[PDB]
Write a protein that binds this ligand. Structure first.
Ligand SMILES: CCC(CC)CN(C[C@@H](O)[C@H](Cc1ccccc1)NC(=O)O[C@H]1CO[C@H]2OCC[C@H]21)S(=O)(=O)c1ccc(N)cc1
Lengths: 99, 99
């Protein structure tokens, strides 16, 4: 679809069998979701931005459905202020900015 | 133009005669630029990032030119590591997310 930006570009995602809302965040290198239990081994990592860093659990090669489009990639889980879909998955679903 | 997300969506912007590199960021409610000494009055504000909040100065009705389109509105200024064009100005230039 084509999404305007008068409101936050929030979409429904499906990960680990759960439905959630996530923000399409072109300013995010990576995808960071709120605390949740996902199958498989995870590695401790830290990611930073405005304000500093937070500790996250890195899950690799995770299936995630974003607004009906499938992606398989790295998902970071931790105390993020909002669920954000970053460029690592936006690229997989063919997302671009246009004006 | 069409901006793919393989790399950070950085573009040249023009503000008050100066050229800067800035992120086209659908995850940012409001435009925020790196520290700069603007004239005029402002309102204190706090913005929430991945690592917590920082304090910024809010300026109103600031003109920024983005790839031939002129946008005017709220421009925050603070100790950010990158210049960010947020939704408040992206909407004015007709910017959409497409996949
Ligand atoms: C809605 C919550 C997000 C944080 C999640 C808000 N951010 C915009 C976001 O695009 C930010 C913009 C940003 C880009 C680069 C450095 C600092 C901030 N990117 C970001 O934090 O991404 C992190 C996750 O992937 C990694 O790649 C970038 C940092 C990591 S922000 O920078 O803190 C921001 C908050 C409020 C306004 N008005 C303008 C910007």
């Amino acid at each position: 679809p084509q999404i305007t930006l008068w409101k936050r570009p929030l979409v429904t995602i499906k990960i680990g069998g759960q439905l959630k809302e996530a923000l399409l965040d072109t300013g995010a290198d990576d995808t960071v979701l709120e605390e949740m239990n996902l199958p498989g081994r995870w590695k401790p990592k830290m990611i930073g931005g405005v304000g500093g860093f937070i500790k996250v659990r890195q899950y690799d090669q995770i299936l995630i459905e974003i607004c009906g489009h499938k992606a398989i990639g790295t998902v970071l889980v931790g105390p993020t202020p909002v669920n954000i879909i970053g460029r690592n998955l936006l690229t997989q679903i063919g997302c671009t900015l246009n004006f």
